[PDB]
C-alpha cells in the first residue's frame, strides 16, 4: 500500500515547495497519477484479501473506497481553486495540505488491518475536516457546525475506543483477519448488549442516522465546497466500512439489537426525503438526500445478508459520486449568485445550457434511473429487505417515489421557469466547472458496464 | 405594457368586468355564433334594465346577486385565449426569451459574427448610461414628499430626456424570440 | 381612459421600443468564418443514399453477424430458438414421417 501512501505524503513537500503559480497544477497532476496507481488495487482475489503487510490489507470493500478518495482529491482541488484565488499563497498551501492529510488518513483507515489503528486514523480525519470547515467557511455558523460535527463524532467514537481496548484484552488481538477467523458468537447479556451499542454507535453517527444526523446538514451547508465533497463522498462511507467490518464480532445479538436502528433508518429515510421536498436551501436538500441514502445503507448493513452488503457497497460508491457532483453543481450557482436559496436563481437552463444537462444527469442518478450503480445498490438492498420482511417494500417504494419527486423538484426549480430578471452576474460556465462535472459523471456511468468492481467482497 | 393598478375598483369598473366575464362564459356555453348573439343581446338588455338605478345600495346588492349568478352559471371549462393566462400556449416561449445582458458575455469571436448589431447595441448602451442621471433627478423631483403613492411613472418632460425607468420595457425580450 | 401623462409616456416608450426592434434587425452581412470534404458534385441523387445504406445498415449488420459468430460459439445457450413445429410431415435430419389418423369424418 506504500505505493499509494508514500506518493501522497510526498504531495505535501511538493505543494509547499511549489511556486505560487503552480500549486494547483502540480497538486492536480500528481493526485491524478496517484489515483491511476490506486486502480491496481481493484484486482482482488475472490477467496482472500490482498494482504500487503501486517499493517495494511485491501479487499473488495476497501479498494473501491480507496479509488474513490484518490479520485476525489483532484476534483476537490479543481473545485476549490476558484474561491481560494484571493487567499495568500501560504493559506492556499495549508488548505491543500489539509486535503492531502485527509486523503492520507482515509487511505490508511481503509487499508488498516488493526481496529485500533483504524480507530486512530478514522478519528484523525476530524482535525483536517474541522480546520477546513471552521477556517475556510463563509458563514458565521461554520464554527457551530464544526462544534456539532466534532462532538457528535467524538461522543460516538470514545465508547468505541473503550470497547476495542476491551476486545484486545479479551480476544487478544484486534487484527481483522484473526477476529474473522476466530469470531466466537456473542451472548445475550446486558454487558454484551452495551458492547454491541458501543461498537455500532460511532459508525451509526458517522453514517447519518435519524436522530443523530443533525450535524450533517449544518456541516455540509456551512463547509466549503471541497469539505462538503469529502464529507458526502468518503467521510460518511467510513461509518459503513467500519460497521461492515465490525459486525463480525457481534454475530447473534445483531438480530435482537438491529430493530431500533432498522426502524429508525427505515422511517427516517421517508422523513428526510420528505424534508427535502420543503427545503429552501439547495445544499441542505442535498445533505438530507445523503441522509436518506445512508439510511438505506444502514438498513442493508443491519440486515447482514450478502445481497444487502453488495448493495451497500455499490450504494456507498454511487452516492459518494452523485452527492459530490450535486454539491459542486450547487456551488457553481452559489458562486455566481452568492446565495444558497433555491428560489433566488431560476431558469438557469436558458442561461447555462450544458450545466443544465449536468444537473439532469446528476438528478437522474440521484433518483436511481437504471442501469445506474445507484439503482443496482438500491435494488439489491430492497430485495434483501423484502426477504427480511415483505412489508419493507412499502417504505422503500415510498422513499423511491419521494426521492424522485425531490430530485426533479430541485431540477425544475433551479433550471426551469423564467430567468430571474434582476440577476445579471450569470456568466458562461468555465471549462473547469464543466470538466469537474464530467469527471464526476463519466466514472459513475462507466462503472455500470463493469459493476463487479463496486459490488464488494460478498460478490 | 400593463397599466399601474388603482387602490380600488370603481363600481363601474366592477360592473364592466362582470359584463365581460358573463359574455365570455356565455360564448363558452353558446358555442354557435347565432345563439351567442341572441343571448348576448339578452345580457346587454339585462344590464341596461338597471343601468340607471339611482340608489347605490340597490345597485351594489344587484351586483352581488349577479356575481352569485355568475358563479353558479360559470362554464366549468371556459374558453381561454391560447396565449392568455391559463391558455394552452401561455408562457410556451418563455425559455426562448433571453435577457439582453447575456450578449455582453459573448466571446469576441461571436460578437464579430454580428458587427453592425453590436455597434447599434453600443449606441443604445451609451443612450441609457447618459440618460440614467436625468431620469433619477426627474423621478426625485416629481415624487411627493411622502413617497410614490402610485406605480405610474412620469413621461419625459423635456426634449432630450428619455422616459424615466425605460430600459427594461423598451428592451424586453421579443414575444416570439426563436 | 389614459391620463395625459400616461399617453405621453406610452407614446415615448412606443417610439423607443420600435427603434429597438428595428435595431434588432440583421444587416445584409452576417460574417461567417470561412472544405474538409472535397466532393463538389457527391451525387445527391444516389451517392448519399447508398452511402447511408452501407454505413447505417450494412456495417452494423456485418458487425452483428460477426458478434453472433463470437457469442454463439463462445458460450452455450446464448441463442436458443423455439423448437420448430412438426406436423405430419418429413423431417430433414432423420427423414421421418407420420399421418394424423385421418379417421376424422370428412363431411362438415
Amino acid at each position: 500500500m506504500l505505493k499509494i501512501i508514500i506518493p501522497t505524503t510526498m504531495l505535501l513537500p511538493m505543494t509547499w515547495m511549489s511556486k505560487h503559480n503552480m500549486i494547483w497544477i502540480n497538486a492536480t497532476v500528481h493526485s491524478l497519477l496517484i489515483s491511476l496507481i490506486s486502480l491496481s488495487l481493484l484486482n482482488q482475489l475472490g477467496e482472500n484479501s490482498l494482504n500487503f503487510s501486517l499493517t495494511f490489507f485491501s479487499d473488495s470493500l476497501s479498494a473501491p473506497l480507496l479509488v474513490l478518495t484518490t479520485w476525489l482529491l483532484p476534483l476537490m482541488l479543481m473545485a476549490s481553486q476558484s474561491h481560494l484565488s484571493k487567499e495568500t499563497t501560504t493559506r492556499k498551501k495549508l488548505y491543500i495540505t489539509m486535503l492531502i492529510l485527509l486523503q492520507l488518513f482515509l487511505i490508511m483507515t481503509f487499508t488498516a488491518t488493526e481496529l485500533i489503528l483504524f480507530y486512530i486514523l478514522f478519528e484523525a480525519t476530524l482535525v483536517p475536516t474541522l480546520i477546513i470547515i471552521t477556517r475556510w467557511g463563509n458563514q458565521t455558523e461554520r464554527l457551530n457546525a464544526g462544534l456539532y460535527f466534532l462532538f457528535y463524532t467524538l461522543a460516538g467514537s470514545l465508547p468505541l475506543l473503550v470497547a476495542l481496548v476491551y476486545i484486545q484484552n479479551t480476544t487478544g488481538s484486534l487484527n481483522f483477519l484473526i477476529i474473522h477467523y476466530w469470531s466466537h458468537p456473542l451472548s445475550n447479556s446486558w454487558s454484551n448488549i452495551f458492547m454491541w451499542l458501543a461498537c455500532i454507535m460511532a459508525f451509526m453517527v458517522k453514517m447519518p442516522l435519524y436522530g443523530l444526523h443533525l450535524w450533517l446538514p449544518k456541516a455540509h451547508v456551512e463547509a466549503p465546497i471541497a469539505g462538503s465533497m469529502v464529507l458526502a463522498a468518503v467521510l460518511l462511507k467510513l461509518g459503513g466500512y467500519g460497521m461492515m467490518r465490525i459486525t463480525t464480532i457481534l454475530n447473534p445479538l445483531t438480530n435482537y439489537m438491529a430493530y431500533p436502528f432498522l426502524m429508525l433508518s427505515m422511517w427516517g429515510m421517508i422523513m428526510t426525503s420528505s424534508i427535502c421536498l420543503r427545503q429552501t436551501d439547495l445544499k441542505s436538500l442535498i445533505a438530507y438526500s445523503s441522509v436518506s441514502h445512508m439510511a438505506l445503507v444502514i438498513v442493508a448493513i443491519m440486515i447482514q445478508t450478502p445481497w444487502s452488503f453488495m448493495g451497500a457497497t455499490a450504494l456507498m460508491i454511487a452516492h459518494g459520486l452523485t452527492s459530490s457532483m450535486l454539491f459542486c453543481l450547487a456551488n457553481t450557482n452559489y458562486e455566481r449568485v452568492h446565495s444558497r436559496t433555491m428560489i433566488l436563481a431560476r431558469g438557469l437552463q436558458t442561461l447555462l445550457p450544458l450545466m443544465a444537462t449536468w444537473w439532469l444527469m446528476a438528478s437522474l442518478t440521484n433518483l436511481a434511473l437504471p442501469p445506474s450503480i445507484n439503482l443496482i445498490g438500491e435494488l439489491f438492498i430492497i430485495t434483501a429487505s423484502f426477504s427480511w420482511s415483505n412489508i419493507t417494500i412499502i417504505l422503500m417504494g415510498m422513499n423511491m417515489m419521494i426521492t424522485a419527486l425531490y430530485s426533479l423538484y430541485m431540477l425544475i426549480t433551479t433550471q426551469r421557469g423564467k430567468y430571474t430578471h434582476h440577476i445579471n452576474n450569470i456568466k458562461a460556465s468555465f471549462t473547469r466547472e464543466n470538466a469537474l462535472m464530467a469527471l464526476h459523471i463519466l466514472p459513475l456511468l462507466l462503472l455500470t458496464l463493469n459493476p463487479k468492481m463496486i459490488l464488494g467482497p460478498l460478490y | 405594457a400593463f397599466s399601474a393598478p388603482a387602490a380600488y375598483l370603481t363600481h363601474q369598473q366592477k360592473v364592466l368586468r362582470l359584463y365581460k366575464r358573463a359574455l365570455r362564459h356565455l360564448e363558452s356555453w353558446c358555442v354557435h355564433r347565432d345563439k351567442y348573439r341572441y343571448f348576448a343581446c339578452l345580457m346587454r338588455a339585462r344590464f341596461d334594465e338597471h343601468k340607471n338605478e339611482k340608489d347605490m345600495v340597490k345597485a351594489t346588492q344587484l351586483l352581488r346577486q349577479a356575481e352569485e349568478e355568475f358563479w353558479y352559471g360559470q362554464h366549468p371549462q371556459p374558453y381561454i385565449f391560447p396565449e392568455s393566462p391559463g391558455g394552452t400556449s401561455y408562457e410556451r416561449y418563455e425559455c426562448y426569451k433571453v435577457p439582453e445582458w447575456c450578449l455582453d458575455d459573448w466571446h469576441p469571436s461571436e460578437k464579430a459574427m454580428y458587427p453592425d448589431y453590436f455597434a447599434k447595441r453600443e449606441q443604445w448602451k451609451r443612450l441609457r448610461r447618459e440618460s440614467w442621471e436625468r431620469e433619477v433627478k426627474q423621478l426625485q423631483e416629481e415624487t411627493p414628499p411622502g413617497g410614490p403613492r402610485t406605480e405610474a411613472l412620469p413621461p419625459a418632460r423635456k426634449e432630450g430626456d428619455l422616459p424615466p425607468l425605460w430600459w427594461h420595457i423598451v428592451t424586453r425580450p421579443r414575444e416570439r424570440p426563436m | 381612459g389614459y391620463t395625459p401623462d400616461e399617453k405621453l409616456r406610452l407614446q415615448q416608450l412606443r417610439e423607443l421600443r420600435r427603434r429597438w426592434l428595428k435595431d434588432q434587425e440583421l444587416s445584409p452581412r452576417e460574417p461567417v468564418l470561412p472544405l474538409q470534404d472535397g466532393a463538389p458534385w457527391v451525387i445527391y441523387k444516389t451517392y448519399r443514399h447508398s452511402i447511408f445504406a452501407v454505413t447505417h445498415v450494412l456495417i452494423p449488420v456485418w458487425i452483428i453477424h460477426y458478434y453472433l459468430k463470437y457469442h454463439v460459439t463462445a458460450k452455450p445457450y446464448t441463442v436458443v430458438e423455439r423448437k420448430p413445429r412438426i406436423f405430419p410431415g418429413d423431417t430433414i435430419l432423420e427423414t421421418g414421417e407420420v399421418i394424423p389418423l385421418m379417421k376424422e369424418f370428412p363431411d362438415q
Binding site: 458562461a428 460556465s429 | 439582453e100 447575456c102 466571446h107 461571436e110 454580428y114 421579443r174 424570440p177 | 440583421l26
Partner: peptide
C-alpha cells in the same frame, strides 16, 4: 427580414 436571435454565449 432576419432578426437577431438573443442567445447565451455558446463558444465556451
Amino acid at each position: 427580414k432576419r432578426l437577431f436571435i438573443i442567445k447565451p454565449s455558446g463558444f465556451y
